[PDB]
Design a protein around this ligand. Sequence first.
Ligand SMILES: COc1ccc2c(=O)[nH]c3sccc3c2c1
Ligand SMILES: [Zn+2]
Lengths: 162, 46
Amino acid sequence: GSGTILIDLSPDDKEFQSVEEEMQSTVREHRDGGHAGGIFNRYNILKIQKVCNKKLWERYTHRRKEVSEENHNHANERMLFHGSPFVNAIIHKGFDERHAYIGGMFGAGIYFAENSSKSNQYVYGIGGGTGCPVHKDRSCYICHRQLLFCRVTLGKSFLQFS
Amino acid sequence: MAHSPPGHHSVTGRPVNGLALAEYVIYRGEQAYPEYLITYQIMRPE
Ligand SMILES: COc1ccc2c(=O)[nH]c3sccc3c2c1
Ligand SMILES: [Zn+2]
């Protein structure tokens, strides 16, 4: 009784098509030559579901208004990818301290990527962990993977050059 | 979980690699909503 329902999008739905295009068009090559996420230029999209949770949405919009009011009515809202072994916990209970990357280069926070292929490196854990649970393959072409495409409030963002 | 830099709500990791896009960090779970769950396979290059 989390309150989360998943609605399947038809591949004929403009909403399915725009989400697939963001997934496919933000693939890049990684400096690890595919060690963490695997070797690929594109995805086979199997399903796109809308995540519906009244409580978690109101939790988001409440915080968004707080940030907006601290930043001249500008939430600075983005659509960004998140890969995690805990995607099931996230869609049911929301993001929290447990989804934080303790060892992250920008501190113990929750990390999001413009590149879908960057988020893909984290589906099986930090640095791809031991890869897919079935084949222990970080480059598995068989096992089904999941990413979240997330609405994120940045507000006033601290610019860190790398 | 750490705090945002004082006077900030998030961090932007600006990409050496001219082709890399930005990474972002929030320090409040409430600042993200998981809108879409995408199920996929990576494809072996031809
Ligand atoms: C360092 O940059 C990133 C970029 C994207 C992600 C991501 O999608 N999920 C996770 S889960 C723990 C770390 C990360 C991460 C880190
Ligand atoms: Zn596998």
